[PDB]
Amino acid sequence: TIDEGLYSRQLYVLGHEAMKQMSQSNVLIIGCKGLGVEIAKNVCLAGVKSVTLYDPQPTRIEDLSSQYFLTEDDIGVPRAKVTVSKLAELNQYVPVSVVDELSTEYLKNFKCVVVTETSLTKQLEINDFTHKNHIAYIAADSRGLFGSIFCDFGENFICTDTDGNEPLTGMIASITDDGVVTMLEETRHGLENGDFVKFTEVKGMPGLNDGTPRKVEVKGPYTFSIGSVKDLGSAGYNGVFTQVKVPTKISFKSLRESLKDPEYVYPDFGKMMRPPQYHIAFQALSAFADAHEGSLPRPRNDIDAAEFFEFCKKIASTLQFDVELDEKLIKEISYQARGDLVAMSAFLGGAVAQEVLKATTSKFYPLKQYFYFDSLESLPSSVTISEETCKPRGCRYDGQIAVFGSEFQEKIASLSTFLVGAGAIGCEMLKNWAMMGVATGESGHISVTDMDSIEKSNLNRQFLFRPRDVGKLKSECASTAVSIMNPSLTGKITSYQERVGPESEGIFGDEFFEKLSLVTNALDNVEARMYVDRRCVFFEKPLLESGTLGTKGNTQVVVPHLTESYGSSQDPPEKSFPICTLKNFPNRIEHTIAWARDLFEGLFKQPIDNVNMYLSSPNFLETSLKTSSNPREVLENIRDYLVTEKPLSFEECIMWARLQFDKFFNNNIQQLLFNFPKDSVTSTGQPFWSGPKRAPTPLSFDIHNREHFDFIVAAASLYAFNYGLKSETDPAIYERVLAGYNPPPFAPKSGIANKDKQELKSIADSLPPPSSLVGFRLTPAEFEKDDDSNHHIDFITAASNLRAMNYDITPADRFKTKFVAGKIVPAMCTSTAVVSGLVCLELVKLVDGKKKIEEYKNGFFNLAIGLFTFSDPIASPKMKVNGKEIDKIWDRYNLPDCTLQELIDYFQKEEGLEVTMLSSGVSLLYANFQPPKKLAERLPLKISELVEQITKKKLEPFRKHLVLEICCDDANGEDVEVPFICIKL
Amino acid sequence: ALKRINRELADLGKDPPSSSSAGPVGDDLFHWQATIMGPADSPYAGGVFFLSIHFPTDYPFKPPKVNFTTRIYHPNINSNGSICLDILRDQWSPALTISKVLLSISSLLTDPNPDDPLVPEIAHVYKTDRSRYELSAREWTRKYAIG
Ligand SMILES: Nc1ncnc2c1ncn2[C@@H]1O[C@H](COP(=O)(O)OP(=O)(O)OP(=O)(O)O)[C@@H](O)[C@H]1O
Ligand SMILES: [Mg+2]
Ligand SMILES: [Mg+2]
């Protein structure tokens, strides 16, 4: 009963069983500050049964530093009471409540308990109970630029899935008598030692088809071993193996036990001696708060720092910790005790929400057990950070001023950022900017662009939108929501509905880009990422890239004249199958799904386009007769869809669907088996239908079968939609119409001048004239995966399953068909929160203007395994040109709008280089090998005039520069790379 | 992209391909029209086959789209000109030049591969009735690939 219209992207990460178990779990959350509200929001979006909040402390101004459900009108009201109402709107299936008082026994009502902003004594009291009653316990803490997470799921936690990867499967070539299983040619199994596999469709060794898992002993990238199969048989041929995943048992220790001997998780391996320091530091923080009526050390206070360090020494001595305390780091923890950053809150809230989901669903590998994190590299160094600057000012930015100071607040308040995209990452970034106070000054401004609209499936991880907003523009809704969160952003945000690309350079031109301070990408495709990267490189603006995929995520920073661009790296491309595999010889469900998509396009989209173009373009036939690769196909499509097979009712649509069933699932298979019989052999004597090729069998239409009826219904409905007829769904009419159908005879054909053009002309003149059909159009079918009433996914699923039945492939359901055909990218709210936190932690580095490349960090993480890693950005490559150091990426030539000859002479006389090629855009302006006449015609022309002449298009009035790519050779004839040219018009 | 394409074009210009001649269409560097000469020891002898090459925006990180324009009677080439070449669909790497692709296509024309065909009827004729396949190939290369 899962609402797949809302959890579409999340089910591809978790699954149906995981979410079913998740929707029966109760979560208690103690503490309703920024971290608590982040965790609660992520849990509510995830879809747990319910959430209960406990926070009786009255609201204060500083709490607004990272709490975005609190307004300045709520000062003096308990935080939970004012947060429950706003949390109840995120998801309609997840009730949210509040409890005024907590008792120990009450904790038995909840599947998971999350604790924030609670002293260590209360945490011990709660854990002593939750541990022995088998209740998952998570404790999170955020102090300035430091964070801590602790997980305790009980002594006998059972983890079904430990990495989140799909089970490995593959096709076997041969299995020896000693269990040596070999993969097909150039096929890697990917297994690891100790794995379990089950075999099926094994020839010569039926015993392995029972399904009992067997151990794996990897002997190489292409072969492994399963042990002794002597009794079962001597040798096995072909077959498919599938990995089997077995549950693991994880044993956690209580908080009291693990304080003495903790088990650390290391988010970074460059600093492996810190977590032992933070372990003492946080306990000292708790002790200090206990000794000062719950008051943390004041910001940048030396006396409190000394007292805190004395507490740290006492704690280290008491616990017999044989670790030398680092005074600088510990006192830094002391200074930022009262810090409250929205980026740290987002990062830790995403992590903790993922841990809660792990506790409820028993999936993925949890943190075991202490996770201490810091982003101390983000602390500004170009401003004054002292007790005077960091003292509170009685404003909503106190939690941030306590870490960065007022001068850095003034720096932030005058930012001019540009956010590309308004998806999940866009919404999170806008929330973080609103909380941080970005662009709240006189000279600040925010610009956000996105051309898409809000859909139902987007509400599962884009918390700034509501069901009443479905169908509206993302950018406007996001701007309004963030202006509601921070009223100071009223009039400081501009929203565009423009796609960022070559066609929008009149809006995002030189004037627009010259005023920015940084650009943040929130896109989902590589084309726009590359375009924005090129624009930033040209204008020399910092860029913040971030991406997610399921539970994985990464963030990258591009700094002018310091690091390399986004396009300097290469990622794996998309896998496209061979045309021969799809056309005739499929062996996986993906091939059949691709074939079904092609069939959909060729049946309901292309012929309609041809018919419409014929009825509109007066000279379409002549152009097609010599332009298209198959004019006969176009003419046949036009004839069939206009006169020959034009339906007059829905019964004719049903008959057409039956005919197409015969055409595509019964006759083409007969032709293929006539060309290549099942007993045929290759040129080397081996059987033809062996290995990757499966012998098909024609299908006979059975009305009672479910797949056949589904295909007929979908095809008839789509044909009626094409012709605008009234479709029906009652099986009675289909069964009545299809009963009286006589299949035309079909026998495979063995085969065995210029008159063809005469036949084409005869067909052409047989068509009705366009003038006789004015105002008549056929509606094409534009593929839409997200709608379940247009019969698109239904048709694709039916066709794919029928073709799988042809080739004896295991059919898939509509869920997997929608996943594959729609190119759906799995997405999660927790990953979005984590990437937003990391990007906002790099943003403060960008604002401070840090120069060294070691101070920036590109981040990668995988939440299914609890892996976090950070690495320095790659420096931009250097080069030697004319005995000078040139940056390959961030350097350019600035030249006037001189003539081509003058440009060549300048490059010859200044750089001592001979120009051999000059191009602009996708046109070759000048080449050394062109005939002399062409050059003599082109040489005395200006660059702008030359570009206009070659591209046959006048330059736009808003165009102010030209980017030219030049390849030149040195005096000796050696090719030397040079930076691009920036011609100023 | 542009620099790599121009380097390939210059390399073609410096050393003639003899049996091939590729060049940009008009002045566009992302659309080439290549020519292939039928091998002497093949049914397509004395034939000129025109191919259209479309370099993707991500070249050389994505394979160029190569499609025959002249009609050819080959087991691995269909009516739309699509070529069953492994180096153009999933084996593509940013290390293969257009000269290598043209050489591969010429070798394919030299000897077809009927065991993994793209046109099952032509492959069946090739495997069963070789003489009729030869006659049909000669007829097609005389009717379409000449003049
Ligand atoms: N070239 C572009 N210019 C501007 N905005 C873009 C561009 N390409 C993508 N976007 C926007 O980037 C955002 C990407 O976010 P996201 O992928 O989460 O949303 P979606 O694609 O609408 O959803 P889903 O992929 O889950 O169906 C979308 O708002 C999309 O409109
Ligand atoms: Mg969308
Ligand atoms: Mg998307």
Residue numbers in the entry:
A (entry chain A): 14 to 765, 780 to 1012
B (entry chain C): 2 to 148
Please give the exact wording used by the authors of the publication that reports this structure.
Transthiolation reactions are central to Ub and Ubl conjugation pathways because they are used for transfer of thioester-activated Ub or Ubl from E1 to all E2 proteins, and from some E2 proteins to specialized E3 proteins. Here we isolate mimics of transient transthiolation intermediates for E1–Ub(T)–E2 and E2–Ub(T)–E3HECT complexes (where T denotes Ub in a thioester or Ub undergoing transthiolation) using a chemical strategy with native enzymes and near-native Ub to capture and visualize a continuum of structures determined by single-particle cryo-electron microscopy. The resulting E2–Ub vinyl thioether adduct was combined with Uba1 (E1) or Pub2HECT (a homologue of the NEDD4 family of E3HECT enzymes) to yield atomically tailored dithioacetal analogues of E1–Ub(T)–E2 and E2–Ub(T)–E3HECT transthiolation intermediates with substitution of the Ub(T) C-terminal Gly76 oxyanion by a cyanomethyl group.
To obtain doubly and singly loaded E1–Ub(T)–E2 complexes with and without Ub(A) in the same sample, E1–Ub(T)–E2 was incubated with substoichiometric Ub (approximately 0.8 equivalents) and excess ATP•Mg2+. Samples were vitrified and analysed using cryo-EM for doubly and singly loaded complexes to obtain reconstructions at overall resolutions of 2.5 and 2.8 Å, respectively. Whereas singly loaded E1 lacking Ub(A) or ATP•Mg2+ can transfer Ub(T) to E2, occupancy at the adenylation site by either ATP•Mg2+ or Ub-AMP enhances the transfer rate by tenfold. Doubly loaded E1 bound to Ub(A) and ATP•Mg2+ is most adept at Ub(T) transfer to E2 but prior biochemical studies have shown that ATP•Mg2+ alone or the Ub(A)-AMP adenylate can also enhance Ub(T) transfer from E1~Ub(T)20. To determine a structural basis for these observations, particles for doubly and singly loaded complexes were individually subjected to 3D-variablity analysis focused on E1–E2 to generate 5 clusters with reconstructions at overall resolutions ranging from 2.78 to 2.86 Å for doubly loaded E1 and 2.95 to 3.16 Å for singly loaded E1. Analysis of doubly loaded E1 reconstructions suggests that Ub(A) adenylation and PPi•Mg2+ release are coupled with transfer of Ub(T) to E220,33 and that singly loaded complexes bound to ATP•Mg2+ are suboptimal for transfer.
